[PDB]
Symmetry: D2
């Protein structure tokens, strides 16, 4: 409606990995993709602060052998019964596990639970995904 240009300083290695992925997706340029990022952020954020009701999936990959991650995960999960519905676990290989934990409840409490889990030791990856 009325465009304003500004500049940003970013480590070159990083900006290039971006350009590669973005180039792949079909984007015409950066401003375009960065705005998406920005636009999505704002939205994902108002929910996170929302403090309402969300249903979510916490996907995580972890080497069950590195530390007591397997221990911690359960203890942490059993600590939040009301918010944790059930959990799917797929043994990816001799050492690695993929586990998606379904959670329902107050976005605030859930976004803080997702954090606790993903903040764990053996946790390699992980991401929360919410719904209205």
């Amino acid at each position: 409606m009325e465009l304003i240009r500004f500049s940003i300083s970013i480590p070159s290695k990083l900006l290039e990995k971006f350009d590669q992925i973005i180039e792949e997706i079909g984007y015409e340029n950066r401003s375009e993709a960065i705005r998406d990022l920005i636009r999505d952020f704002i939205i994902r954020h108002e929910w996170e602060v929302g403090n309402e009701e969300v249903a979510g999936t916490i996907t995580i990959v972890y080497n069950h052998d590195e530390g007591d991650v397997v221990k911690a995960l359960l203890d942490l999960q059993h600590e939040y019964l009301d918010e944790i519905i059930s959990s799917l676990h797929v043994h990816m290989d001799e050492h690695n596990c993929l586990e998606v934990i379904v959670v329902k409840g107050e976005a605030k409490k859930i976004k803080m639970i997702a954090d606790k889990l993903l903040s764990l030791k053996g946790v390699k990856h992980g991401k929360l995904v919410m719904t209205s």
Copy 2:
């Protein structure tokens, strides 16, 4: 390492709600905020680059009456058995569903299926969380 600098054209109201949320969270500059978003975008999409062997969860939400969405999904999924391992399904309310589909395979073929799924009359959007 080399710190490259560049600028982007962005609509005001958009750039407004951003800075606006930026303060709240506690950033120092837009460059910090924006860089993160980028590091995160890379994390989320690097798999779409190349053809490495991936594995993860495809979370979606739907209405099991609103169309053939249900049969469609099964017919579709059952088409790519090899890539789709299992899938958890929570019933949110009387008509709306939450279903996490776990998969593993080659990025190109994975995104091929991810797209075909997300794009169906009945599928009301659905995020992806894939690693390698």
Copy 3:
């Protein structure tokens, strides 16, 4: 403590299939296995009539294509939200599905729900399994 012998009439084809399986398990004879059956029955039964609290797994295999079984299953499941926790579904092949539905609640209501489901059209197999 004080053994009483009685006799039973049973289709020969049947008694032989029994003898085969029982022979396989490691049983020394029939009375032995039949008593197990009887002993288990009595126990599984007092729960079923129990009317208390149980957590259960309803495993079922069905050709999603034969009838609207896929339809019926969801409609029936969404009809019992409070009792149905979540559901795992594994696409066994182009036509067949294995789906284990987790349920919690009043044994009476749950044992009657398990029935409704397994009584469905496309339903080939199925069995309820309860816990204290």
Copy 4:
């Protein structure tokens, strides 16, 4: 078809609670009751006969603190990846778990794993529901 007749030695108190429950349910004779139990036993175990390719759910219940039960399970399961597909896990209370493990493979190897699982310090019993 030929109706064979045979008799069995059974302890009274046992044969007592049986007939006792038989009336309730509404049977006409013990022979009806007993025959069913047998038809059902066959349904539940025919897979243990031979080596056909089976698939189903191994439902179990445990206490995630009571021993190494948890790590044990994972180490064990991760040993037979090929046969074990996925597994749903509900948290019942503060220390007790419910976990349905979905598998597919050859009867002999399936029962081999089923046994090794059911028999572990931490596993407080667990039923099997397998077909072909």
